[PDB]
Ligand binder design. Structure first.
Ligand SMILES: CC1=C(/C=C/C(C)=C/C=C/C(C)=C/C=O)C(C)(C)CCC1
Ligand SMILES: *C/C=C(C)/C=C/C=C(C)/C=C/C1=C(C)CCCC1(C)C
Lengths: 133, 133
């Protein structure tokens, strides 16, 4: 077949390092690049091609129901088992992850056009802000 | 609002490293992770939440019609101009990238469940294999 439409996930990657070295791509960009999965999305109408290649590091999925506490394995992250509960404090999605780490959790809330995410573990607070795409 | 649906992209990320040390995430991983941008896909139904967070390095999009030559500026990659032509050699999509480097181009083709991709430059060949999703 000539029909390549799809979302394609890298299964294996050989001498990627050689190919970038030939492109004169720098060492810092290369040591990252070799630690990533590529995803190629191809949208194709006969001779018309649209191609997007993304390079991922890790994926953190969580499915939950507010108020229903759940067992979470943080594979991808620190690979620990916690005991998670998400509730509403007003506008704010609050999650408490019980386990070995003190003060471990997160807050997620909307203000205006933006999403706010506070990540907390111990006395470290990471704050992130997102725009809609 | 409590409605958090959307596909969100990070515009800032404060103290991701402090948070990551706190979790006991390893050094090498922290150094990659800190150099990525994040996307949170949020699927929300009442109190049902499906959350997916990706970490993402560089992307590469390219649009073309087969048989029509175009100037491809590899913004992001090596930042060079090439005259790129994509043709069919049987079931194999073949791109030659006329520019500074010799033997610069690639080959896409499907064989069964898999997409096969060859990237070449100079005297280097990179093989990749992908999976339908
Ligand atoms: C070098 C390099 C990259 C290059 C990817 C290329 C060159 C993909 C070509 C894809 C095609 C043509 C698929 C069909 C990435 C993944 C962006 C990550 C950074 C390192
Ligand atoms: C509601 C969204 C939440 C709770 C997002 C959590 C995301 C993280 C805790 C970030 C995880 C990552 C690291 C700690 C380093 C590796 C890359 C990430 C982004 C998966």
């Amino acid at each position: 077949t000539r029909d390549q439409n799809g979302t394609w996930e890298m299964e294996s990657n050989e001498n990627f390092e050689g190919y970038m070295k030939a492109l004169d791509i720098d060492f810092a960009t290369r040591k990252i690049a070799v630690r990533l999965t590529q995803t190629d999305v191809i949208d194709q109408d006969g001779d018309n091609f649209k191609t997007k290649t993304t390079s991922t590091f890790r994926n953190y999925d969580v499915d939950f129901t507010v108020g229903v506490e759940f067992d979470e394995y943080t594979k991808s992250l620190d690979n620990r088992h916690v005991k998670a509960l998400v509730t509403w404090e007003g506008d704010v999605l609050v999650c408490v992850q019980k386990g070995e780490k003190e003060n471990r959790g997160w807050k997620k809330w909307i203000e205006g056009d933006k999403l706010y995410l506070e990540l907390t573990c111990g006395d470290q607070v990471c704050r992130q802000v997102f725009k809609k795409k």
